[PDB]
Amino acid sequence: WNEVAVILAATEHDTMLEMSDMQVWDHPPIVSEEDISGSLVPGSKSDSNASFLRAARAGNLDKVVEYLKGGIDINTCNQNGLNALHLAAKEGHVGLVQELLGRGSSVDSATKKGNTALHIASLAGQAEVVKVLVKEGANINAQSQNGFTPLYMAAQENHIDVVKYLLENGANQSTATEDGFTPLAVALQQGHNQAVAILLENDVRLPALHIAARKDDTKSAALLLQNDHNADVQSKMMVNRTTESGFTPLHIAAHYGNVNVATLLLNRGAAVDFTARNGITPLHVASKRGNTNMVKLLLDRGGQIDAKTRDGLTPLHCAARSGHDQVVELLLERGAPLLARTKNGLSPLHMAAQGDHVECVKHLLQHKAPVDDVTLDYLTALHVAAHCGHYRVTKLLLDKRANPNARALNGFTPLHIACKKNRIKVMELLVKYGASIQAITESGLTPIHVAAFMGHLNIVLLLLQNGASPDVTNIRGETALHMAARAGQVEVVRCLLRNGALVDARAREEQTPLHIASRLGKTEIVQLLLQHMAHPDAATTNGYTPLHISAREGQVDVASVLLEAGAAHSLATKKGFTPLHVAAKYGSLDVAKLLLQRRAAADSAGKNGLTPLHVAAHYDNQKVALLLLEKGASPHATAKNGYTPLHIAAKKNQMQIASTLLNYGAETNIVTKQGVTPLHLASQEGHTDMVTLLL
């Protein structure tokens, strides 16, 4: 059958995803001001509209009004949609803006990017242009493209007076962008304490607190937490309110190692062990990221040193997996459970070995961890270091007296595993430290079995050069050559044959590798085995030679290489069947033709007296029966039953095959030993069209 189920990554996947969900997702956007070209190209108003816009940017109200009287539409814009009022408002020309307003320019005209004149002036920091526009009736809460407001633009660039003015005129602090950010958010993102203090001075607060947790802004964090009261329910407090990802401010500060803002939050009542997602605590985040002092503060403030995620990761697990040997040492000195286990039984040592972190293994074994502590499937840390090909941790583990022959759950030894994953470095190292070259699993696979079946040619080479006999058998009786042929690894088969492998080794059913190569159609491997003195007439227990198998499975090319190599063309099995009988049994038509072209007897007979025509008559094989009749098979031959193939076709209701038989001169008035004719069988079985077709 299949040997793939007989021969750990899906085990690693779950805790790997639970350590992947310890990430924090996001910065507020920054506005970029518009670009101005001034080119003439923009129907005879081209050079005039263009020179007019140039005059508006340069700030010359003389040539601008003189141009306006020359009959140029005031709502004239360039490629991007910029008005004379936009160009004037960006540059602080207060007079040009006043005259442009009186001359008839619209206040709330927006470019292609949706910025009104008030937008442009706010981002640029023209306090007086803003005063003119606000007093003239401009929409102070105008949302540009993506929803930015002038208050947002001023707060982003720390234009303080613009912010004080827009707040005095009543600008909405709450109006957020398309993704949810307010002026306070970007003011915190840029590090403008002045702005932040001003916007917080009059009347939103929570996402600002999360940004302050990322930014280590203790000033703004202390400012945001003055209206929140130390209630008896920590969940209601603003210091413990979460993002959309379930993370609290303390979780975030733990992610960025921000010790100061974390101390502030904890002093304002931030709860130290609030879980997010599948049980992730701030200790888990700080530990995964290696933030040593964050871990120190969290433990000092009553953090659970042994808290488990859903699958069982403790903070020491996370720190060990990530190679944060300082957090590992701190956690260990504070008394972390050295042998806490995940749901599949992994110790922190298994994680540290899984990430090739030598220093974490050194500190873990220093604190008396058992070097051969096993998982639930009995995988030592050396097993994991071998599965990952990590050379350094394998060297250290072996140097600290880890057993290189440790048997795993299925009998697998670190050498077996390093051989299944093609780790030449780790395999050679394990052998140096005493791994048994020819140790077997519970299913009897040596390392050369595993490497040969998996096609790792260099490993097969190294094992063969180290003294691995390729003729060790598994519980199915198969040597490395059998499985190397079952999987189709041609180069490995050549390497085994060239290095003394038995060509015709017998397994269960006394079958050689040639039988398996014929069953699976491995044509090139049939060639390779035959070339190395494989007897092509080798028979199994039921009597099949490789020719019989090609006749059963329909492999025509294999039958070709076999017959050209001298395979006996009409050999008997236990039931006395020749390859032609088998071809007539399984409908292999081409193999039957190729068989007959090679001097195969058209009507060979077994112990029972049957001919391939009888067989084809039984199994309702029309084309092969026809090919036999054409090649010279008699339809009047009998068996031990006195049966012609016409009796057989008559009993089992073979309409077409009996048609071919009668058309080829099949005797109808033929009797058996017990006085039976095909009319008696045809009538007894209950076939109408049959008995009709006889007469």
| H runs (alpha helix) in 341-423 | 348-354, 358-366, 381-387, 391-399, 414-420
Which of 458, 459, 522 lies closest to 487 in space, CA to CA?
522
CA 583 to chain centre: 45
Place of tokens 């032609």: 580
Q: What kind and span of H or E run contains 657?
A: helix 655-663
Which of 471, 542, 484, 477 lies closest to 514 in space, CA to CA?
484
Return d(Cα 13, Cα 503) in angstroms, integer.
42
Domain that holds residue 253: 1-695
Distances (CA, A) of 317 to 20, 336, 470, 483: 14, 10, 42, 40
Return d(Cα 458, Cα 597) in angstroms, integer.
44
Technique that determined the structure: X-ray
Return d(Cα 406, Cα 509) in angstroms, integer.
33
CA angle 328, 405, 442 (to 5 degrees): 115
Place of tokens 């936009």: 86
CB-facing half-sphere around the CA of 616: CA atoms within 13 A: 32
Which of 447, 432, 449, 364 lies closest to 394 in space, CA to CA?
432
Return d(Cα 272, Cα 284) in angstroms, integer.
11
Residues 6+ apart with CB under 8 A from 295: 283, 286, 287, 315, 319, 327, 330, 331
CA 389 to chain centre: 20
| H runs (alpha helix) in 455-545 | 457-465, 480-487, 490-498, 513-519, 523-531
**Structure tokens belonging to residue 13:** 């996947």
Q: What is the DSSP letter of 168?
A: H
Residues 6+ apart with CB under 8 A from 453: 3, 7, 445, 480, 483, 484, 486, 487, 489
Which of 340, 277, 270, 276 lies closest to 305 in space, CA to CA?
340
**Structure tokens belonging to residue 130:** 């803003």
Residue 598: CB atoms within 10 Å: 14
Helix (H, G, I), strand (E, B) or coil at 546: helix
Which of 403, 305, 323, 312 lies closest to 361 in space, CA to CA?
323
Residue pair 393/405 in contact by the 8 Å Cβ criterion = no
Across the strands, what pairs with 276? 280
Which of 141, 151, 156 lies closest to 186 in space, CA to CA?
156
Helix (H, G, I), strand (E, B) or coil at 405: coil
User: Domain count of the chain?
Assistant: 1
Return d(Cα 240, Cα 233) in angstroms, integer.
10
Q: Which burial class, exposed, middle or buried, applies to 450 when counting CB atoms under 10 A from its CB (0-12, 13-18, 19+)?
A: buried
Helix (H, G, I), strand (E, B) or coil at 83: coil
User: What's phi and psi for 183, nearest 5 deg?
Assistant: -55, -35
Q: 550-580 as b/e, with b when 16 or more CB fall inside 10 Å?
A: bbbbbbbbbbbbbbebebebbbbbeeebbbb
Helices 94-103 and 127-135 pack at an angle, to 10 degrees, of 20
Residue pair 523/559 in contact by the 8 Å Cβ criterion = no
Place of tokens 């129907």: 43
Residue pair 418/386 in contact by the 8 Å Cβ criterion = yes
Three-state secondary structure readout of 529-598: HHHCCCCCCCCCCCCCCHHHHHHHHCCHHHHHHHHHCCCCCCCCCCCCCCHHHHHHHHCCHHHHHHHHHC
Which of 319, 395, 407 lies closest to 363 in space, CA to CA?
319
Virtual torsion, Cα 46, 50, 52, 57, nearest 10 deg: 170
Which residue type does 48 have?
A: S
Distances (CA, A) of 40 to 6, 45, 478: 78, 10, 86
Place of tokens 């050379």: 391
User: What's phi and psi for 310, nearest 5 deg?
Assistant: -70, -40
Return d(Cα 82, Cα 120) in angstroms, integer.
10
Three-state secondary structure readout of 253-322: HHHCCCHHHHHHHHHCCCCCCCCECCCECHHHHHHHHCCHHHHHHHHHCCCCCCCCCCCCCCHHHHHHHC
Residue 181: CB atoms within 10 Å: 23
User: What's phi and psi for 276, nearest 5 deg?
Assistant: -135, 150
